[PDB]
Design a protein around this ligand. Structure first.
Ligand code: HEM
Ligand SMILES: CC1(C)[C@@H]2CC[C@@]1(C)C(=S)C2
Length: 405
């Protein structure tokens, strides 16, 4: 289902990439995207899929576009347009200067100082989940760790019942990796139905949780509105539920396949932080975009007002112009160049949280379960979307090679 080419699009710029179902998905999600970076592909292409939109393919262009909010607006950041249109998260669907006030508040809730305070729980949960798995000699890493670990921490931060996970996780998934079961607006609405009563409750009787702080916050000298609080919280939920979860699975799949990388981390732990960056580069997984505010000629291509453009954060670090041998995992790269957590004014506020969760997992897993692999005859399937993911990750190990702590 290709959309008819608009008049302004030169036929030579056409490359029919489906962000939701790329062609070489079997080879892995990052590799399926990386087709965009082959020599036969222009830097800036138009795809007829998902209603027609531009895609910048090179880290240089992606960064420029991300910097330029005047031309590339966040108003409609999701493809397809109906999703971008329904999209009303804060701060994400706002441009500076307006964005700034909302960002400052979101920052109060997820930033460094929160990470620092939660550090002990993160460590406690990771150790507990791992120890609980260790003697089994097998899990479903996606269901058994990648989900619970980051989610439970978010749940704790947000002061929401663990019981809500399944319902919430379903709705968030619908947003990044649409099933066809529900449209964006429907999904958005169901999440909002969820949050409304809670926000209400927390404006009346505040707690110390993230929702309480957002609901009762100050933006541009006045109080946040209920609707504004709803729209921030909605974003927080998607970030909490859908990011760290998927990343861990890519990373753990790689480690399961690469003894020499595991060993490296076991023997030279000083390297963890560097490896975490390298994994964030190689297993980058986010792709959103912007909307043209006006007619604009960008690197010799004429963009029309209202045109959406995908600026895949995933792609920058995979670009050979940015990193030599991109598909190769090297913990000792002199410079790890990525835009995994975004670029420009929308840089990921939850990054500090994400990094802490990753580093803990690496350290803690490797400590107890140094030797593991993918289950014999399991085929690992990746899934593409706004946030890419791994369907299931069956791991096996010999308990006798594990270490209790
Ligand atoms: C592996 C982990 C994650 C990755 C790769 C990631 C990636 C991103 C990207 C690419 C953006 C910018 C999007 C844009 O420019 O359209 C961003 C923004 C954002 N993310 Fe993260 N994210 C992660 C984890 C999280 C977590 C754990 C949270 C906390 C709930 C979260 C909260 C946010 C917020 C609040 C923003 C918006 C900042 C603003 O618009 O000013 N992220 N994320
Ligand atoms: C990856 C996303 C595009 C999705 C919606 C905003 C975003 C930056 C976070 S955090 C979740």
């Amino acid at each position: 289902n290709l959309a008819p080419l608009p008049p302004h699009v030169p036929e030579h710029l056409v490359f029919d990439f489906d962000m939701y179902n790329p062609s070489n998905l079997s080879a892995g999600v990052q590799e399926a995207w990386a087709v965009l970076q082959e020599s036969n592909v222009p830097d800036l292409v138009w795809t007829r899929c998902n209603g027609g939109h531009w895609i910048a393919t090179r880290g240089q262009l992606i960064r420029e576009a991300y910097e330029d909010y005047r031309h590339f607006s966040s108003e409609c950041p999701f493809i397809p347009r109906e999703a971008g249109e329904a999209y009303d998260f804060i701060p994400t669907s706002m441009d500076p200067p307006e964005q700034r006030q909302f960002r400052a508040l979101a920052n109060q809730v997820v930033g460094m100082p929160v990470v620092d305070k939660l550090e002990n729980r993160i460590q406690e949960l990771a150790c507990s989940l791992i120890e609980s798995l260790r003697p089994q000699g097998q899990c479903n890493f996606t269901e058994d760790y990648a989900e619970p670990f980051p989610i439970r921490i978010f749940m704790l931060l947000a002061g929401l019942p663990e019981e809500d996970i399944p319902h919430l996780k379903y709705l968030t998934d619908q947003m990044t990796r649409p099933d066809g079961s529900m449209t964006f607006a429907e999904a958005k609405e169901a999440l909002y139905d969820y949050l409304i009563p809670i926000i209400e409750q927390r404006r009346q009787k505040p707690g110390t949780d993230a929702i309480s702080i957002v609901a009762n916050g100050q933006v541009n000298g006045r109080p946040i509105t209920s609707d504004e609080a709803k729209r921030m919280c909605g974003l927080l939920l998607v970030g909490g539920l859908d990011t760290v979860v998927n990343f861990l699975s890519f990373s753990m799949e790689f480690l399961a396949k690469s003894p020499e990388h595991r060993q490296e981390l076991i023997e030279r732990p000083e390297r963890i932080p560097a490896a975490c960056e390298e994994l964030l580069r190689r297993f980058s997984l986010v792709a959103d975009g912007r909307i043209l505010t006006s007619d604009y000629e960008f690197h010799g291509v004429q963009l029309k007002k209202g045109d959406q453009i995908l600026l895949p954060q995933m792609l920058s670090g995979l670009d050979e112009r940015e990193n030599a041998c991109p598909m190769h995992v090297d913990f000792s790269r002199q410079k790890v160049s990525h835009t995994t957590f975004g670029h420009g004014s929308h840089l990921c506020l939850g990054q500090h949280l994400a990094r802490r969760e990753i580093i803990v997992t690496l350290k803690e897993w490797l400590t107890r379960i140094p030797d593991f692999s993918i289950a014999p005859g399991a085929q690992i399937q990746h899934k593409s979307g706004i946030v890419s993911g791994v369907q299931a990750l069956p791991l096996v190990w010999d308990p006798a090679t594990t270490k209790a702590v």
